[PDB]
Amino acid sequence: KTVVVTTILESPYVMMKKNHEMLEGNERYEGYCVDLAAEIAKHCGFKYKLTIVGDGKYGARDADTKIWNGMVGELVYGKADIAIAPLTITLVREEVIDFSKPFMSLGISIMIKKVSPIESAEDLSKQTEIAYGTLDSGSTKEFFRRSKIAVFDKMWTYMRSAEPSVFVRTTAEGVARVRKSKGKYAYLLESTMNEYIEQRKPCDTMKVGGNLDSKGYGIATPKGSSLGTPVNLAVLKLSEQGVLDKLKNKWWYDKGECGA
Amino acid sequence: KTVVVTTILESPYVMMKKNHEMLEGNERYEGYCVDLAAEIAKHCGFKYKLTIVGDGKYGARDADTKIWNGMVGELVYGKADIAIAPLTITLVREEVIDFSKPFMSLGISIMIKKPQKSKPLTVERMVSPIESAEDLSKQTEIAYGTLDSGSTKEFFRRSKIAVFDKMWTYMRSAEPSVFVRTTAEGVARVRKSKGKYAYLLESTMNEYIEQRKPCDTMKVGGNLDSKGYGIATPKGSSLGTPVNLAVLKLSEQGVLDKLKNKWWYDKGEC
Amino acid sequence: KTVVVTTILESPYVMMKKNHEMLEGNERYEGYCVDLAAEIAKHCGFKYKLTIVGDGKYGARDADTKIWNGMVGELVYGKADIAIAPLTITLVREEVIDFSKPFMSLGISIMIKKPQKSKPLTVERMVSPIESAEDLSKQTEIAYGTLDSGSTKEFFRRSKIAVFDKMWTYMRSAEPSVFVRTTAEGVARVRKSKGKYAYLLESTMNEYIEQRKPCDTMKVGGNLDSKGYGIATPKGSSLGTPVNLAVLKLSEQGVLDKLKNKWWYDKGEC
Amino acid sequence: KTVVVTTILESPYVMMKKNHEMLEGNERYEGYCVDLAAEIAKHCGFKYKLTIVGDGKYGARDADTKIWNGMVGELVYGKADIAIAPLTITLVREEVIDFSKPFMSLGISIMIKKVSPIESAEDLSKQTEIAYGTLDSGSTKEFFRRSKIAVFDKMWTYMRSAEPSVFVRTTAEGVARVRKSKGKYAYLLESTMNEYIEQRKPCDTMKVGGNLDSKGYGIATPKGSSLGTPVNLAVLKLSEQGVLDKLKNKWWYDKGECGA
């Protein structure tokens, strides 16, 4: 029995190869998440098929309709049996799906065009001259919405009541917006994504300040599934054996097509 | 029903208060784990009583006897119900108990005595004989050891990386023993060895000791691996899900990093 | 019974909200004084409705008619119950109304246009033609004036100090008039006069405007006197003691300091 | 009828004249408060007699006794009719006596022996290497005891549970302790007192940082007394005519027996 895997087109997690016209099956994908899924399948011993979620959504809740979208919605409604993807472990998501142990630590970071005048997020919130936003239907926007710390509340009130729409559909779109804003737009995204972008050409973006908080990516399964314990054990074994270190080094530092 | 909270005596996690002679109950202890458990109880309502393992071991399965010792050992057989303590999540431990999401990350670091400032225009420079782990393994003049019945020793035992394999090969055949019974004993060995000993401990305790007086020790290199501390709970128990959700709520709310900052950097004596 | 709170339209005390074309009631205004009124109502359980004086005057006495105008004027004749506004405590006002203890201090300062950088080793320096009130009184080229129907104008009118007496004699016989109907109008005069006008206003408004865009003005010298802002209440009213005790409680707690910090130093730029 | 005035021996408010063994009445006292009392009496029109409170205390509340000591106790129990002295205006004191409009502003200040390692009070609270304390039966210890801001609570807990007693009987004794502690002891006192001490010989002490808050000195009067309104109007008139400024200049910025 094959296992349907839902992923999202994200670099360096899932890339759609470069010469994929003649490729079929799982061989048309590449990235950290593809290798992680291969190792998970090898450890557990099942045959899997990689699939891209129809909507490029990580997972959220719509306007008071109690319907999950994206990869979380794909898992909840039985469309997929596992989600190997950069899916943040959050309280709201844990109540509907099971998360394994985190395989990669991360945090919220600020990305701007290439001493910065803002640096820390407090100066970013205090100064309204520059604009900042997040990725829609994600986990950073949900972090800012449900936050209670005053600086996060004022940041969220800025972003929600902003003209025009400060949110972006895809992190690539937000990166392009930051690059084309001539240093007038700031991006709030995951630290790993910011590092990967800043270590790649044309190297016109960079990360400022520290990390607002710390989270992690987990491998998600439908609630009450029979694969949660095997994937948890496989993730623990891979972390102990240094496979995750090797994969991160391969997909984040080994290429490094930038001078730094 | 009053459940017990088994915990280890480690700083700044749990330690006896200055006036701990006359108080009783949970008021005797202070640190990060005590108010972490207080927050856990505040979120999900349950009464708890702090307990300390007699042997003072974090947990490891003994060889040829198949008897788990330490905190994990007494948690498996039922003499405890939950362990709010710096217990490292490992595959060997997960096979017998249920862990929660890590409430704080950590790594394995190297602790050495801080050398004196180099005299040579009129600038002072800090030069250390060990800068990573590979050179520490290569050299011989500086000895290094781990903590007995800990996660670091277990990690080095089954490691397949060449550097860590060679480190374990050196450590097992060492005379006199380089292993210590407590992290306090390892820190004392580092401070009294005049640079002839290096301690391998978790990065959190390493930084905490580095920030406190007499601050004669420094940490070299990066983190050997990336791990975390999870709240332990016996397999099949009903407390796993409430504690997991409480940890997630605390992480999302900002209590966790505030506690870490106020118990790791606010008292930056050195 | 719903009482009315009279207040002047002054920044950053009370200003109309950006989206004030659809809101109503207390939600139409924001600033320092609305927060002060909210804290006063939180201390003692009374319901309030903000009102704005029609003439927009702080309060004075019309000459040869012995009548009060402005906020104090309409407070004396029973058309308001409490004046939570930046109203200066003066002897002439104390004879008709009751003033609580000051909730923040202030002083009369001088405001002039900020001069450009002096190019002439390669260090820029700021040189101002006015450095105190004495030289401002002595010089003639730069004109100066106070706010109409305000506390500073009255202070200059009955002053016996030689410098202030000379300044008042110059002001009363100045053609064209140097007095202004609003603080904003005076700041506009300073900005548009190209350095040929100086504005005498309270240090709080001076600093607030100096710390806001386009910030082409600066404060010179020191405070000509020490004064305070008191909550005004009609004579023989039952609210005087509660509001006085509330101001004391807020000062002891520190709400006044945080309000000052978050409305004077957190909203500044340049 | 003469009016009994209660004062406290404090410089530069009430001093003892150099040649006073042969002087009777109010002629043996000098200072800011003596001049203030003289001007108040001149404005209102009564004759007054200055007296020193039997216990050199400003006034506080005993432990579970509901008894006022010091000048406040001298006012409540009918021993005195008015108190022209550096008495701070506080909520707990306004419930037993009436305070006029403040005639001099002030605030908490930190005093050290002459790099400024102590710097702001947050560094004072974070560091247990250096010691500090307040005056007993005053308005600063009461401010620290009833405070709710975290730094003030931790300073208060440190001072109350300290060995030996960090508090001092008289502010002069506290200044002497600071001068004789070789920089090992800090003093918390009023800004005006700190400035007067730092501008006088041997001027081996100095003020560091900014005022922690802002209070004022008021001329106290027993509750429901007929003198409240006259003294309030007199203080207002004196402030508007610059008499208070002249007196402060005379007693603070006119002698200056130190290089400054």
Ligand SMILES: NS(=O)(=O)c1cc2c(cc1Cl)N[C@H]([C@H]1C[C@H]3C=C[C@@H]1C3)NS2(=O)=O
């Ligand atoms: N260096 S990293 O971000 O790629 C990274 C981060 C992490 C890893 C492994 C790696 Cl390689 N494993 C840990 C897991 C292992 C065991 C201990 C904590 C969890 C359970 N989570 S983590 O601390 O989020």
Ligand SMILES: NS(=O)(=O)c1cc2c(cc1Cl)N[C@H]([C@H]1C[C@H]3C=C[C@@H]1C3)NS2(=O)=O
């Ligand atoms: N900055 S820190 O080490 O105190 C720290 C470390 C961690 C925190 C929270 C903090 Cl404050 N939460 C995460 C948890 C939150 C959710 C995502 C990963 C786990 C589940 N684990 S963590 O990555 O080990």
Ligand SMILES: NS(=O)(=O)c1cc2c(cc1Cl)N[C@H]([C@H]1C[C@H]3C=C[C@@H]1C3)NS2(=O)=O
């Ligand atoms: N720092 S400030 O100008 O915002 C400020 C100024 C003042 C405050 C409180 C603050 Cl926060 N309280 C005092 C009051 C408290 C008691 C002593 C004097 C009056 C009654 N008045 S004040 O000296 O005018």
Ligand SMILES: NS(=O)(=O)c1cc2c(cc1Cl)N[C@H]([C@H]1C[C@H]3C=C[C@@H]1C3)NS2(=O)=O
């Ligand atoms: N410069 S000073 O400390 O000598 C000083 C301080 C103050 C003075 C007068 C002087 Cl000279 N008067 C004011 C009072 C006058 C009227 C306005 C505020 C109160 C009522 N209080 S104050 O702001 O505490």
Ligand SMILES: N[C@@H](CCC(=O)O)C(=O)O
């Ligand atoms: N890592 C995030 C991406 C969305 C975001 O950037 O907020 C997630 O999985 O939800």
Ligand SMILES: N[C@@H](CCC(=O)O)C(=O)O
């Ligand atoms: N935290 C480790 C012990 C500390 C160490 O090994 O340095 C454990 O749970 O085993």
Ligand SMILES: N[C@@H](CCC(=O)O)C(=O)O
């Ligand atoms: N606060 C003053 C008005 C401001 C000014 O005169 O500058 C008053 O109540 O009269």
Ligand SMILES: N[C@@H](CCC(=O)O)C(=O)O
């Ligand atoms: N000015 C203070 C002195 C007491 C102290 O310094 O604590 C008072 O009148 O209470």
